Amino acid sequence: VTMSPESVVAAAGGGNNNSGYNEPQRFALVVIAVNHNVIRIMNGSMGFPIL
Amino acid sequence: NKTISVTLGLRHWKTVSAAPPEKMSKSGVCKIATNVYNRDGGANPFLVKYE
């Protein structure tokens, strides 16, 4: 990931009143993935045959 | 006399052996499909004895 000049200049403080970035800003990165799976129902029980 | 409304003899109520015999807290199955992320191979172990 390559960030942006707006982000790198808003990270530092010095913003005037009601500018949002008056205080120094901190950022974090989050990644989510969606995957398939198989569930087996037998003998009154459940489990993942593939794990 | 006057006509009487039919009384639907719906009974059903077969219930269900939902309660296990004692607690039947045992449905044992094991991981089978070599987990996931099968990882690397022999990773060249070799030997280090000074020939």
- Return the number of CB contacts < 8 Å for A and B: 15
Taking the CA of residue B19 and the nearest CA in chain A, the distance in Å comes to 12
Which residues does residue A40 pair with via DSSP β-bridges, in sequence order?
A: A47
* Phi and psi at residue A8, to the nearest 5°: -70, -25
Supply angle C-alpha A17, A23, A28, rounded to 5. Answer: 135
Cα separation, B51 vs B47, whole angstroms: 10
- Structure determined via: cryo-EM
CA–CA distances in Å: residue A28 to residues A3, A4, A11, A25, A31: 12, 14, 12, 10, 10
Resolution of the determined structure in angstroms stands at 3.5
Cross-strand partners of A46: A41
Asked if residue A49 lies in contact with residue A40, where contact means CB atoms within 8 angstroms, the answer is yes
Q: How many CA atoms lie within 13 A of B15 on its CB side?
A: 3
Spatial distance between the Cα atoms of B10 and A26, rounded to a whole number of angstroms: 66
| Separation of alpha carbons A51 and A39, rounded Å | 9
Chain B residue closest to A37 (CA)?
A: B36
Residue type, B6: V
Question: Residue A36 and residue B45: Cα distance in Å, rounded?
Answer: 35
